[PDB]
Chain A
């Protein structure tokens, strides 16, 4: 019963908001997406150890208590910069550039692949 009372009290228009430094008298300060700051006598349904400054929390649309912890969102353009299509041009499709191809591969792919050949030497990979 207590959990379903929480559930009915967890309807989600959330006011996503940033966390600011926590206080003792364990309790949090919130800056809303509407650029107004609140203090919470108790943080809410999330635990203090999870939260941290500059976090994204979904709070109650009216009481502004924190009741959800959110994955950080950078920007729509930044996500648009991410490659999802994964293009297909092969290395064989590149002509004459074999030395440049080798340089780029050894600089980029090898640190991703192994990291053992570099660490066995102690060098910082490029």
Chain B
């Protein structure tokens, strides 16, 4: 309960080895710095990172967004349908495979 959530945001140009331009998801564009210890090379334009919501400093570069819409668009049951259940499409099955 003592913990506080961090602000997510995509990152942009690395102005220096310490000053970076993050872009909070549906939010403003800031210039911010990595905390102290995180890598700087992997901090490339297009890496989801968490922001401390007091100084907006970069911490905990997250892998990437799954966007639960996409999670539903993957973890959906397609059925047990096999090729031996489709009939009369043999040439078309050959093409698709």
Contact = CB atoms under 8 A, between A and B. Distances in A.
Question: Touching in the complex, A and B, CB below 8 A?
Answer: yes
Interface of A: 6, 9, 18-21, 23, 29-30, 35-42, 44-45, 53-54, 59, 63-65, 67
Contacts of A6: 1
Contacts of B60: 39
Interface in B11-49: 24-27
B8 A37 contact: yes
A20 B3 contact: no
A36 B1 contact: no
Interface of B: 1, 3-9, 24-27, 50, 60, 62-63, 65-69, 71-72
B72 A53 contact: yes
B71 A53 contact: yes
Contacts of A42: 3
Query: Which of B1, B25, B66 has the most A CB atoms < 10 Å from its CB?
Result: B1
14 contacts: A21-B65, A23-B62, A23-B63, A35-B26, A36-B24, A36-B26, A36-B27, A39-B5, A39-B50, A40-B3, A40-B5, A54-B68, A63-B5, A64-B4
B62 A29 contact: yes
A44 B1 contact: yes
Contacts of B8: 29, 37-39
A41 B1 CA distance: 11
A25 to B, nearest CB: 9
B64 to A, nearest CB: 9
Contacts of B27: 36
